[PDB]
Symmetry: C2
Subunit: 621 residues, 2 copies
């Protein structure tokens, strides 16, 4: 299991910009403008536009509240008139340069509109949102705007049942079959397009947790799924009419068998796209369904691993489906030539199959009956990237950054259900949790996370029920000396001797080749050896002394030394107010002397020692 965060920043010690609007709650949707200078925030009954560099600066705001009349009809349906019968923004996507596509629960009457960015006024289309936005604010949903087409995953009705993954377009509107083999009580998590290159079609991936049809246990077992459809899908001609002919799904496994750890509940997914790396990586956040005392895990998957399963793996087959009971097993028979679930490609095309509409019924009937793959999509290295006890993580974003020495790091930012944010990097041999910051002082769970993209200073935006918080990717300035800046082992921070400050790389002006940084934690490379704080004390004989000492690291052991020896602070001679401060009770002349508060922190190969504080004590009389 990962260690505890090395440093804990109280909301206080650090600078965090916050945004919220009196009497407006549930800031669950965030979207950066195309120019990246503005951040759009979808909340309950409102949408705001704020400076992406300082979200406390509100630029625009618009409301879309439910009429008292409509709120009346909604309460009649037996819903909370003060919580449920409101318009919770659920879709907030880019439509064009001048507008956004916005959908809200509209008091259990899903509706969509266009937000004119120029006037920042809703156009008032009030389109039906059934199928693209849920009815209930508690229901799960996901969606992704792909070439002007909204691909959605959510519940089709008021009860939250009738799960549906559909693309509603003017031309080819497709959807999933209302059948357990396709979707079995799924909880939607994420959806994104994997296009890149190339005549290769683009695929839209959907991620969710659903009840497994292939696993049996004491009670219903949940299982995470990675699924995808082809953007160019057109539905079948006689079969799968107006339904996907490319829908395939597979298990997404995050576990540690030797430990009997199984994280079968998917919480979030992030697609890491790197200009320098040819294949995107899916970072996924899981929690266990069984005996969850508070465990969380992060697994990373190579897209090519997922692609090989859908393109070359075996399908599962429902052998016997009735009272003898439906059993799902590996299908060993022959597979229809145009591979079921495949996107129309060179071969398919080089055989007259130009669109899904002319695919053979054999191929179409097969896919309609075998949407589940037999193989599991496994993580990179076949193990989780991070497993953490005593924390319920809710979201994850990953930033690829280069340390001073060129080494590239995939820094994971994961929030918690208590409003905090952990920053971690895998440091080959273990996971290093650089720090944790309390984003929300009310301890509201973090519901959504978003990395800033503008060229320049980088930030993370976190949304919760009480507001949005903007945080920098690092607090380098918080480290007052080279040893500390170096011991943080934070790829974003380096020491700048000329300025005598721990600086944030890439964006900094400091001595490029003169900056210091050691991802090994070997502060021995620093120029000076800070000797901590120095202070003289003059106390009244008999009285009691209290010597202050404290440091930021949670992984360092601090102790006192006096006259070349380690002080044993117990009683009634000593105290220890704050498990750091030394207390000396019967102040007699024997207590006169030099007291040192040292710290020992085991880093990579070597352990580092530091003088935190030095006190010269003189008891008078």
């Amino acid at each position: 299991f990962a260690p505890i965060p090395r440093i804990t920043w109280e909301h206080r010690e650090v600078h965090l910009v916050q945004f919220h609007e009196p009497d407006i709650y549930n800031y669950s949707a965030l979207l950066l403008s195309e120019d990246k200078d503005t951040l759009y925030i979808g909340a309950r009954e409102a949408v705001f536009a704020v400076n992406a560099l300082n979200i406390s600066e509100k630029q625009h705001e618009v409301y879309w509240k439910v009429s008292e009349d409509k709120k009346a009809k909604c309460a009649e349906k037996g819903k909370s008139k003060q919580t449920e019968c409101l318009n919770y923004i659920r879709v907030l996507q880019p439509l064009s340069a001048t507008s956004l596509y916005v959908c809200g629960t509209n008091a259990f009457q899903p509706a969509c509109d266009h937000l004119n960015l120029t006037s920042f006024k809703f156009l008032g289309k009030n389109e039906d949102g059934k199928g693209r936005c849920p009815f209930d604010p508690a229901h799960s949903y996901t969606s992704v705007m792909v070439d002007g087409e909204l691909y959605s995953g959510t519940s089709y009705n008021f009860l939250g049942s009738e799960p549906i993954i559909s693309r509603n377009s003017s031309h080819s509107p497709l959807r999933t079959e209302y059948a357990i083999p396709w979707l079995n009580e799924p909880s939607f998590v994420f959806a994104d397009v994997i296009r890149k290159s190339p005549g290769e079609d683009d695929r839209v991936y959907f991620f969710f947790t659903e009840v497994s049809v292939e696993y049996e246990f004491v009670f219903r077992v949940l299982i995470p799924r990675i699924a995808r459809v082809c953007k160019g899908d057109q539905g079948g001609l006689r079969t799968l009419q107006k339904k996907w002919t490319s829908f395939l799904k597979a298990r997404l496994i995050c576990s540690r068998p030797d430990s009997g750890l199984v994280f079968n509940v998917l919480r979030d997914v992030f697609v890491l796209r790197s200009p320098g790396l040819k294949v995107p990586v899916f970072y996924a956040l899981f929690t266990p369904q069984l005996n969850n005392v508070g465990l969380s895990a992060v697994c990373a998957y190579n897209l090519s691993t997922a692609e090989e399963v859908f393109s070359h793996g075996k399908y599962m087959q429902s052998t016997t489906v009735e009272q003898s009971h439906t059993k799902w097993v590996r299908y060993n028979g022959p597979v229809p030539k145009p591979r079921p679930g495949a996107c129309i490609d060179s071969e398919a095309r080089a055989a007259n199959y130009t669109s899904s509409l002319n695919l053979p019924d054999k191929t179409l009937q097969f896919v309609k009956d075998h949407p589940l793959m037999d193989d599991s999509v496994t993580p990179i290295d076949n193990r989780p990237r991070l497993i953490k006890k005593d924390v319920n993580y809710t979201q994850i974003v990953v930033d690829r950054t280069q340390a001073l020495d060129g080494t590239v790091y995939d820094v994971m930012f994961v929030s918690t259900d208590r409003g905090a944010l952990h920053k971690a990097i895998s440091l080959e041999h273990a996971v290093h949790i650089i720090e944790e910051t309390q984003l929300f002082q009310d301890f509201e769970p973090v519901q959504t996370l978003l990395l800033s993209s503008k060229k320049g200073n980088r930030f993370v935006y976190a949304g919760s029920n009480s507001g949005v918080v903007q945080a920098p990717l690092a607090f380098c300035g918080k480290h007052g000396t080279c040893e500390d800046c170096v011991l943080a082992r934070d790829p974003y921070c380096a020491w700048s001797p000329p300025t005598a400050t721990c600086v944030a790389l890439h964006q900094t002006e400091s001595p490029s080749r003169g900056l210091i940084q050691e991802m090994s934690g070997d502060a021995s490379v620093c120029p000076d050896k800070s000797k901590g704080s120095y202070r003289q004390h003059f106390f009244k004989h008999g009285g009691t002394a209290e010597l202050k000492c404290s440091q930021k690291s949670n992984l360092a052991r601090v102790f006192w030394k006096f006259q070349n020896g380690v002080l044993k602070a117990e009683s009634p001679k000593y105290g220890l107010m704050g498990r750091k401060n030394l207390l000396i009770f019967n102040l007699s002349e024997g207590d006169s002397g030099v007291y040192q508060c040292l710290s020992e922190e085991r880093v990579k190969n070597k352990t580092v020692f530091q003088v935190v504080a030095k006190h010269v004590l003189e008891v008078k009389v």
Copy 2:
């Protein structure tokens, strides 16, 4: 989840009698004399007889070490000569008033002998213990002597690859089939007889955890089982020759579906009989196989619940789905003439079947292929009696006692893998862990737990690798005041006004109707509440004094009061020395007076206060 132990007794504050022999280890088998007040202990290479009233007092001792010859012959087999190639006693059972049946691993060469109690010397019978005793001291095992016949559950061979439950009698020795459907890599936990009326046969029940064949998951899932055979079984004539004809098993479930908690690994079972109980109760201890960060649970089962399943439940059926892959489903077909797996009772006698040897082959073939029941044996109330976090419980014994007001409590004594004992009860829809005692100072896991049968002063004996410990059912004498005594909410303890002491309700000569006990924890009625701890303080001016405050409640919030009003141990004038003690810095004079230390505790719906310490100090000017 249950709370933490309310009171914590150090190994030294309470008095525990201990027994151990120099150089003798692994005290895993305990047996109480049928008549005499003697406790027989089987360790590695030895068997002792000690005073059950004071186990540290040895009465007899006989040894059975393996010669250096076989020691090497065994070490020649790839086993460790100084630890594995020794004679671990595994069976210690009563044979007759003057004899004990004893079996030991005997350097990977199971052997059984008689122990003449009179002379307390072995008869050198050297019977082959293959099947009745394991080869490896690390292999699971269990057994019970029934009418002079040993029913054993363990491994049949050197490697422990072949599991077996058998009765190797002189006339009708029976064993289980060496087949997956019967036993699938089981780990044996417990075995006991359930005597039956008038005519009905006695059943011998077996408890073990095995790899489930009916469940399919990410990886192999374990499942606890309760199984039984009929004592009168004689095997089949032309089918199941020399094999049980009454072997049936079923899943033993301990879970709380509401929070996704499932404890599928069985650790121990205890049968609660008590004269005021027409039907025994099975208390079982479980831990989870999945995501186990240290979770334990106790579930109680009604014997009649299991009987219903075995006599009226549907069987499961193996189905060779596809090819080479078998799945287990519920069987709905017709069930053979006399019920497969039933004992020879009335319906069979009435059909002229007087022995398993007369059962129709159709019935015998069915039971051979259908040993698994389709229904689960579920706990009383369908939920655990206790679920505890951060603890790994190893053994359990239960004592049914009656409080002073007549209320009956099933007190659960559960040991931990760190050598401690917890005493817990079900109190007003919640679990109350009365206390925790460190039985073994070496923190050795408690391997076996035994509860002595009511005979005035009762005890619990715990055996570990390092020795055997004896503890009373309560430490009533450790509660100094009536308030302490009542607050403990221990059904064994009551306050004796006449003697001004907390006494064991059932061993005191103090008039019972005068005794004070309130399981609600309300100590209002207690006499002389001006507790006890009272201190006088002569303190110099400008000095610094620590005011000691002691209370045993791990659940209490203690605070201080000053001249009527509740003080705030807040700097710069105060400071509590690590939760408890109040320090008064710079002994001024307005600081002179009486200091009260109150302990606040929630005892039901009520919040109560107890003056834990009274301090009267005057700083001399």
